[PDB]
Design a protein around this ligand. Structure first.
Ligand SMILES: [Mg+2]
Ligand SMILES: [Mg+2]
Ligand SMILES: [Mg+2]
Ligand SMILES: [Mg+2]
Length: 166
RNA sequence: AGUUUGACUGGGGUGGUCGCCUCCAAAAGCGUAACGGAGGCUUCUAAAGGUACCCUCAGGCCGAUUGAACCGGUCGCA
């Protein structure tokens, strides 16, 4: 509930002013922050799948699950049964507290960030180091917004404090 | 010493075949031949059985660390 007040009390009263909606339901609202990482190396050494679960739980605070394969590709020794991914889907306040742990301490501990979305307004971040966080083989981060285009998504994105670029 | 030592077959022998399943030949009911054209079987599951409740693939595109694998979105009667 750190950026929650900053969004409803403060950030919302400015988005309607600029884009000029006739209501308050047209303004973008990120609804979840999905985190994921690929463990193709575990196809031959699967002891590093449990360790990923333990690490992917200390960061967000909520338990994660393995992701099972879905294809039959020999070039990755892949048959449709192996656990090769770990995902966590933060939502509501759980992503709100997590977001503040990242904009202030994660980007600061980097050794800023690209500006390119999928086109529907969902910025996704792949950081190649897991020790960028406090609790800690990178991991994907995706903020699924309620926006329509990149224009609406960007305004929600920069208001939070994402370092972005230019 | 008494006997046995298959049949089909564009002559016989050599080769191939011999029971069962699916398609075409088959002429819009059923059936229907060729040493006509194609493939399979001689199993499997203690759940891959029963029921209640629930769910939806393949592929392409855009985004994204190691990346046709993982995640987000969306076009998708399959
Ligand atoms: Mg006699
Ligand atoms: Mg004869
Ligand atoms: Mg008929
Ligand atoms: Mg007839």
């Amino acid at each position: 509930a750190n950026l929650k007040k900053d969004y409803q009390e403060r950030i919302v009263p400015a988005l309607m002013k600029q884009f000029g909606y006739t209501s308050v339901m047209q303004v973008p609202v990120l609804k979840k922050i999905v985190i994921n990482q690929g463990l193709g190396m575990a196809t031959g050494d699967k002891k590093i799948i449990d360790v990923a679960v333990s690490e992917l739980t200390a960061i967000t605070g909520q338990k994660a699950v393995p992701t099972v394969s879905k294809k039959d590709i020999s070039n990755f020794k892949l048959r449709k049964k192996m656990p090769i991914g770990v995902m966590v889907t933060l939502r509501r306040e759980q992503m709100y507290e997590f977001l503040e742990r990242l904009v202030r301490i994660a980007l600061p501990r980097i050794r800023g960030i690209e500006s390119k979305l999928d086109g529907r307004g969902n910025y996704t971040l792949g950081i190649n180091e897991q020790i960028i966080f406090p609790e800690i083989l990178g991991m994907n981060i995706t903020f699924v917004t309620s926006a329509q285009s990149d224009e609406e998504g960007y305004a929600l994105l920069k208001e939070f404090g994402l370092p972005f670029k230019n």
